Write a protein that binds this ligand. Structure first.
Ligand code: BEF
Ligand code: MG
Length: 1006
């Protein structure tokens, strides 16, 4: 049963075989529960933890470490060789559980921000003639449902009859409309009307606001409007976050490097196993040089890279949680740092979705045919009665204003809504209509009777001032609102007997024939009528767009005996002459943090767009208010509707999404079409929103931010949830996503620089013929411990000063540039020659070591030979740990100096001293003290074939290590062009180390 809005209530009730008087029978209900099922949406599938770790291995970087560990395992099968593949598996497993523990922790925080109040419904079934309250899931299409004020709609209902005079429904959840909609039972002929044009339909998820009505259910479960939208959110595809796309692009670059050094080492060693060795076949000799080349490629892959990447994201996600921001995924904490466009819903997201009175005026002075108006302003933005009234922007008390004392009397009495406080969530709510709760919240702010509010708690502070006025004036029968008169009045007697009327301005003021100037009753003239009406047009038509409501009273009404409370026409006949008292202005006001945030986002180069389902009047008026538009800037080509964007040319649609900042009256499917167009322009789009009309857009975007007050369907599609409804947290999230990305490039270069330095060392050791300086067991401790501590501390780098004053990064540029590749190639070639040059120095030029020649070292496998050229050298000295602890200490000391100049990308170490990052200087003292731990404890100098040094050897380590700082400061200088307490500290060190004279004395090749 679709398009039930187009059919009359007779044919809709006839289709289900149901009568409104009696209702559905038990035999029809179980029959319909078979065909249709439960009136509930399928619960979102929390994926198995075993399937959760599967996406933790979808990353390309961890797949390279799996292939590296799987390769290193089979080469060991042909137990210290099994140590490296075993710890790589633990690193990948411990890294995967942290990614799973975060997404599991993020969930438990989001579903904690949910009100699991049981959803019920009041149906009319043939079992009992009276109404019965059943569960919502036990409702089937065809049920006659009766829902009154304050009740949530259980299912899609076709209205059959309105029991009250008018029915008002709050549909901001599904349509984004800020104002309550009036409903009728007459059919809407258009078979493809939008949910805002179906005025004879009650959609599920919405709530009634004013009256009482009955209807027949036409859809349940996934057939409801919230069900069709949720099905659309599931149908949308989810692309990878831009950080995962950068890391994967770097993963193909890391793969092309290790594949080159594996192919290069192989081909330079080809034609070289035809030697008289245990070969015999070319196919058997290409296996030997393959096992040494692939072992060299695996040694180029940084083992601890994804583990320090996860720590940087997990430490950042913890920083957003303190700002009341729940991030589902780890890579989604960077997306806002590269966001170009922020698309934002208006109702509930940019505004509070809570009607607030912010302007009111009464009469001050009337000399003749002209007057002066006392104009006030109120500061509240929510339903909480926490506000202050300001006259001439200075705090004013409304006690000495007799016109304000009677203005609050009409506002408190004439409305029939209320303001309750729920300690469960801790926020005040509206009971009836939103515009009548705005009057209730106003009366509490302007304490006209100066009641004592210090001792009262939150529950009675909601209706403290209102109940006072009710005690002064008891409420008799009410002349309720009629659409033709467009006004509402009440009858009240003191504990005389005035009549209070409230309605549209021009409708009320025209009936008014007097003015309440303070305490006097002054006859109103057409001159002062034009002035107060001019202020109404100032509030209605200006950029200060406000819903205006005129408040008046009747000093001499005839008694209840002569009243006829059955005719709409006589209602305007009982309030013919009234006394104009004042007028109030209310709107759905933007959140207090939204105004400054669109300004901070503009400096950061981020463009904010309003994509709302409400009309372009309210949409543009809030755009001018928050700062998206100027108070006088025209929006002819910058503000579109859902329709006006449909009949736009594709060429005109291009500069629409590129130059338009407001989109009004758009369907839930339109919101994701706009997000899709913005990503077609290659932009990282962030969607902020609440309600069901935003769920497809929240998923389609690169990152979707939901409000804590939003719906559950909205928080499901979103990657981030603002728990406290703080729009400033989005600006703080952009600043963190930019610092994390900057710091991520720092410890990515630092880590791949350390591995290329170890590859050049092993390659150079093979070409020169020297004994092995660095064995793979100590290359594991270096990359994990001495490299992991400074790389983790590089995530704590101080953020730039112009970090939020520059455009977002281009999504095409990679992590490692072409220049940054050469820059870490230079570092890698240094550590290769430094570590080999430090082991060779002990073998050739050191005092304590044997002073063998280069020939006598290139052929160290021929020493126990009788006496070819090895006259007096021992063969055991070629297995000595002293040249191995020389190359390990230089490697560790260079990485400490390379972590020191990885504090900034281009800024020098004099301009940015190392104590800028106190975690970096503290982690270096830890990696260096853990290196001295390996040398002097009992068992570890045997696990690593190394030995403690002396001061003469340790001074040589620094002479080889320190020039890596001069080498990078030189590249930093080139990168830029194309303090004093720090200098006076390093200078005593540089002169003390370099005062001694020493050489390497490698007369041969290198
Ligand atoms: F909730 Be939005 F204004 F569509
Ligand atoms: Mg909304």
């Amino acid at each position: 049963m679709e398009n039930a809005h187009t059919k009359t209530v007779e044919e809709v009730l006839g289709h289900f075989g149901v009568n409104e008087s009696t209702g559905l029978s038990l035999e029809q209900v179980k029959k319909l529960k078979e065909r249709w099922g439960s009136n509930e949406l399928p619960a979102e599938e929390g994926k198995t933890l075993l399937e959760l770790v599967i996406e933790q291995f979808e990353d390309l970087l961890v797949r390279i470490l799996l292939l590296a560990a799987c390769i290193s395992f089979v080469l060991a099968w042909f137990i210290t060789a099994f140590v490296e593949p075993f710890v790589i598996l633990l690193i990948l497993v411990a890294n995967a559980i942290v990614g799973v523990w975060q997404e599991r922790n993020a969930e438990n925080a989001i579903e904690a921000l949910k009100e699991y109040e049981p959803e019920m419904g009041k149906v009319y079934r043939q079992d009992r003639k009276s109404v019965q309250r059943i569960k919502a899931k036990d409702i089937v299409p065809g049920d006659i449902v009766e829902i009154a004020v304050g009740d949530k709609v259980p299912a899609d209902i076709r209205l059959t009859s309105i029991k009250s005079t008018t029915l008002r429904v709050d549909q901001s959840i599904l349509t984004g409309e800020s104002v309550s909609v009036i409903k009728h039972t007459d059919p809407v002929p258009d078979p493809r009307a939008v949910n805002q044009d179906k005025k004879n339909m009650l959609f599920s998820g919405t709530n009634i606001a004013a009256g009482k009505a009955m209807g027949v259910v036409v859809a349940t479960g996934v057939n409801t409007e919230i069900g069709k939208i949720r099905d659309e959110m599931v149908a949308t595809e989810q692309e990878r976050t831009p950080l995962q796309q950068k890391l994967d692009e770097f993963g193909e670059q890391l793969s092309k490097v290790i594949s080159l050094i594996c192919i290069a080492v192989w081909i330079i060693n080809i034609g070289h196993f035809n030697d008289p060795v245990h070969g015999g076949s070319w196919i058997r000799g290409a296996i030997y040089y393959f096992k040494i080349a692939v072992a060299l490629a695996v040694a180029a892959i940084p083992e601890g890279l994804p583990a320090v990447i996860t720590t940087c994201l997990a430490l950042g996600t913890r920083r957003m949680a303190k700002k009341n921001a729940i991030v589902r995924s780890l890579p989604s904490v960077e997306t806002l740092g590269c966001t170009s466009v922020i698309c934002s819903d208006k109702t509930g997201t940019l505004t509070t979705n809570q009607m607030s009175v912010c302007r009111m005026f009464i009469l001050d002075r009337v000399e003749g045919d002209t007057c002066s108006l006392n104009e006030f302003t109120i500061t509240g933005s929510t339903y909480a009665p926490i506000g202050e009234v300001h006259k001439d922007d200075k705090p004013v008390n409304c006690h000495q204003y007799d016109g304000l004392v009677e203005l609050a009397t009409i506002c408190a009495l004439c409305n029939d809504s209320a303001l309750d406080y729920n300690e469960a969530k801790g926020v005040y709510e509206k009971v009836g209509e939103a515009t009548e709760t705005a009057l209730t919240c106003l009366v509490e702010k302007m304490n006209v009777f100066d009641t004592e509010l210090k001792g009262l708690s939150k529950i009675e502070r909601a209706n403290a001032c209102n109940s006072v006025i009710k005690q002064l004036m008891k409420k008799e029968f009410t002349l309720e609102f009629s659409r033709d008169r467009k006004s509402m009045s009440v009858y009240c007697t003191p504990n005389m007997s005035k009549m209070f009327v409230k309605g549209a301005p021009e409708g009320v003021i025209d009936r008014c024939t007097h003015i309440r100037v303070g305490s006097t009753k002054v006859p109103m003239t057409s001159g002062v009528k034009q002035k107060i009406m001019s202020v109404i047009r100032e509030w209605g038509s200006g950029s200060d767009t406000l819903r205006c409501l005129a408040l008046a009273t009747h000093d001499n009404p005839l008694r209840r005996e002569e009243m006829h409370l059955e005719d709409s026409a006589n209602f305007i006949k009982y309030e013919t002459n009234l006394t104009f008292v004042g007028c109030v202005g209310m709107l759905d006001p933007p959140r207090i943090e939204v105004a400054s945030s669109v300004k901070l986002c503009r400096q950061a180069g981020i463009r904010v767009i309003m994509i709302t389902g409400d009309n372009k009047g309210t949409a543009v008026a809030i755009c001018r208010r928050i700062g998206i538009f100027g108070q006088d800037e025209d929006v002819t080509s910058k503000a579109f509707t859902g329709r006006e964007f449909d009949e736009l040319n594709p060429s005109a649609q291009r500069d629409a999404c590129l130059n338009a900042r407001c989109f009004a009256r758009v369907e839930p499917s339109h919101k994701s079409k706009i997000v899709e167009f913005l990503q077609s322009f290659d932009e990282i789009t962030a969607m902020t929103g609440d309600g069901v009309n935003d769920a497809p857009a929240l998923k389609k975007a690169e990152i979707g931010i939901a409000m804590g007050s939003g719906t559950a369907v909205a928080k499901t599609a979103s990657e981030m949830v603002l728990a406290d409804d703080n729009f400033s947290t989005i600006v703080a999230a952009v600043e963190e996503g930019r610092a994390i990305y900057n710091n991520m490039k720092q410890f990515i270069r630092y880590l791949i620089s350390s591995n290329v330095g170890e590859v050049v060392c092993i390659f150079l050791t093979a070409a020169l013929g020297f004994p092995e300086a660095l064995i793979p067991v100590q290359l594991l401790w270096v990359n994990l411990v001495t490299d992991g501590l400074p790389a983790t501390a590089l995530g704590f780098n101080p953020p730039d000063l112009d970090i939020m004053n520059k455009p977002p990064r281009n999504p095409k540029e990679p992590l490692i540039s072409g220049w940054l590749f050469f820059r870490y190639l230079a570092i890698g070639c240094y550590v290769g020659a430094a570590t080999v040059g430090a082991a060779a120095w002990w073998f050739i030029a050191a005092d304590g070591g044997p002073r063998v020649s280069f020939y006598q070292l290139s052929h160290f496998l021929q020493c126990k030979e009788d006496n070819p050229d090895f006259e007096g050298v021992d063969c055991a000295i070629f297995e000595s740990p002293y040249p191995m602890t020389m190359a390990l200490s230089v490697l560790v000391t260079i990485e400490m100096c390379n972590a020191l100049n990885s504090l900034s990308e281009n800024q020098s170490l004099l301009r940015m001293p190392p104590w800028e990052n106190i975690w970096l200087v503290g982690s270096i003292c830890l990696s260096m003290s853990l290196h001295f731990l390996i040398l002097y404890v009992e068992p570890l100098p045997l696990i690593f074939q190394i030995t403690p040094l002396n001061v003469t050897q340790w001074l040589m380590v620094l002479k080889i290590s320190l020039p890596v700082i001069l080498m990078d400061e030189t590249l930093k200088f080139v990168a830029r062009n194309y303090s004093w307490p720090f200098v006076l500290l390093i200078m005593p060190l540089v002169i003390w180390v370099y005062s001694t004279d020493t050489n390497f004395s490698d007369m041969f090749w290198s």
